[PDB]
Design a protein around this ligand. Structure first.
Ligand SMILES: [Ca+2]
Length: 274
């Protein structure tokens, strides 16, 4: 029995897939803690590790295998279902078993992604401070046609103090906030003027270490829904430029309220892709 997480139908991923578009030919790189490549519900085609002592194909934390699952859990008779199940998955390890990464490691991951022709980059990570190297790394990738997607942050909204993290804060990166199954903004979701779009981030079930599946909360779970949506949009319209894919996502987002808390609203892949 394959489970279908609320997240896929909520963003209308199921409608698009039913049309035949599943992300085939689109190269998606997941910049995270790696992925458990042996997971039976995943097909990791390659990648690289910029973390010392850990190869790219193992995940001693769980976070990367979970994010990876939301994007591409295989469409079959077992486990869960990804947003773009026929995508080419590349595991780029830039975070350690503790889920922490240095700027250089991340920067290497971004550069590797660009140099190796990836189509979409997912970054479910973020710090309080940026870096000039990271900004260059991300500007060039996007300018080279790569769709950059990152988690907005899990600092909630205490105050009126823009809590968007980096690299989400950068102009070339799409900042993704999180909503629950009722489409309401999850309390932990970062707010700020850079907040672009929302996606399911509360209570998302996906592939998890050592051939199992678990439920997690966080904007980190939200980002992969958008990365996969970009992959769907690209599989249906391969001649689109990154920003064009970007524009479809924002323009067709379902209005939820003030952008400071919701961006342009909840993504709708069917409207975005047509
Ligand atoms: Ca499956």
């Amino acid at each position: 029995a394959q489970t279908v997480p609320y997240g896929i139908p909520l963003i209308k991923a199921d409608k698009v897939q039913a049309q035949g578009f599943k992300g085939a030919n689109v190269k998606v790189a997941v910049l995270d803690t790696g992925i458990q490549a042996s997971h039976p519900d995943l097909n990791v085609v390659g990648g690289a590790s910029f973390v010392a002592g850990e190869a790219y194909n193992t995940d001693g934390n769980g976070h990367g295998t979970h994010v990876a699952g939301t994007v591409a859990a295989l469409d079959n008779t077992t486990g869960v279902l990804g947003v773009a199940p026929s995508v080419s998955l590349y595991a780029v390890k830039v975070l350690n078993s503790s889920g922490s990464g240095s700027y250089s490691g991340i920067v290497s991951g971004i550069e590797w992604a660009t140099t190796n022709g990836m189509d979409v980059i997912n970054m479910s990570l973020g710090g309080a401070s940026g870096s000039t190297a990271m900004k260059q790394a991300v500007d060039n990738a996007y300018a080279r046609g790569v769709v950059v997607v990152a988690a907005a942050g899990n600092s909630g909204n205490s105050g009126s103090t823009n809590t968007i993290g980096y690299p989400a804060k950068y102009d070339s990166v799409i900042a993704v906030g999180a909503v629950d199954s009722n489409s309401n903004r999850a309390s932990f979701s970062s707010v700020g003027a850079e907040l672009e779009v929302m996606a399911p981030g509360a209570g998302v079930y996906s592939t998890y270490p050592t051939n199992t599946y678990a439920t997690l909360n966080g904007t980190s779970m939200a980002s992969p829904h958008v990365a996969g949506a970009a992959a769907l949009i690209l599989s249906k319209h391969p001649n689109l430029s990154a920003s064009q894919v970007r524009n479809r996502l924002s323009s067709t987002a379902t209005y939820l309220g003030s952008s400071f808390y919701y961006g342009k609203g909840l993504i709708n892949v069917e409207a975005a892709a047509q």
